[PDB]
């Protein structure tokens, strides 16, 4: 809800200082304290970093000793009636702790499951909390609420080490820009008007229902995420199974050639917000899935390269969508994180909305293909 916007204004004025990955949900904002290992799903497309999910466990139970302190301070005041706090840990206690305690080699309860799935594992090295209980237009945001954080990956196959320099190549276990976005999306999309249209339409309606329900999305996600077991996945009820019944045959077996595009968009949809899910279902039911499509495409074309503040020009009303605070494209952009206005310049472009925006474009480009 509102909890999203505030974190935006937190990192908005901070200009992504030290890749302070923002928190996504409130039920998972309580789990992001120091020394909290997170897991990250296998690397998706090169244009969005999949959300860091928590496993709800610490690291003192992960080495041989089951035991340090957080080098607090760093008062970062308010950002405008809301003061913020942070907790850190100096590298000097990282190397000394790594040398004082050695890997608890007898540990395969989650470790075997992780190395089987092939995920990446990161450790929280810095946290952003509050020393105030802020309530503003109402919600009840408690003291100590975590808004952002920083990670350091580690790898475990023979030894252990921290990766304050996050290399994309190295995993825990063992190409272009907007023009590339065009090519990649096109190559993926062309592999979908492959099956017979009747099934395509059935999938679209199933998705429409799924978008209105986050829980259905999550359930479908768990059934086939990084398991992809040899056995046919058991269908689930509701529109999620209406999607899964579209993705299998009479026996129930799945085909990776059709699966890969589905998980891709799933990642594209997990990056997006709940309200954006609802708006897409409305745009599918109203067949207005092309207006915002061309808009976002031309905006991303004029915003190259990304990660650099540059005001954009193109007006959306001139293109064809209805404008005015409340319009679908307006609220869509605001949910992605772009500041809109009524007169010129009608847009400010920020680097932090990089990942989500590409996914928004990707979702649009895929839905228009089946309509």
UniProtKB/Swiss-Prot annotation:
Keywords: Cell membrane, Cytoplasm, Glycoprotein, Immunity, Inflammasome, Inflammatory response, Innate immunity, Lipid-binding, Lipoprotein, Membrane, Mitochondrion, Necrosis, Nucleus, Palmitate, Phosphoprotein, Secreted, Transcription, Transcription regulation, Transmembrane, Transmembrane beta strand, Ubl conjugation. The keyword Mitochondrion applies. Residues 175-187 are annotated as: Linker helix loop. Cleavage by CASP1 and CASP4 is not strictly dependent on the consensus cleavage site on GSDMD but depends on an exosite interface on CASP1 that recognizes and binds the Gasdermin-D, C-terminal (GSDMD-CT) part. Cleavage by CASP8 takes place following inactivation of MAP3K7/TAK1 by Yersinia toxin YopJ. Glycosylated: O-GlcNAcylation by OGT leads to reduced cleavage by CASP4 and decreased LPS-induced endothelial cell pyroptosis. Changing residue 172 to D: Abolished ability to induce pyroptosis. One of its GO terms (cellular component) is cytosol. This is Gasdermin-D. Pfam families: Gasdermin, Gasdermin_C. The modification S-(2-succinyl)cysteine is found at residues 54, 200, 358. InterPro entries: Gasdermin, Gasdermin_pore, Gasdermin_PUB. It comes from Homo sapiens (Human). It comes from the Eukaryota.
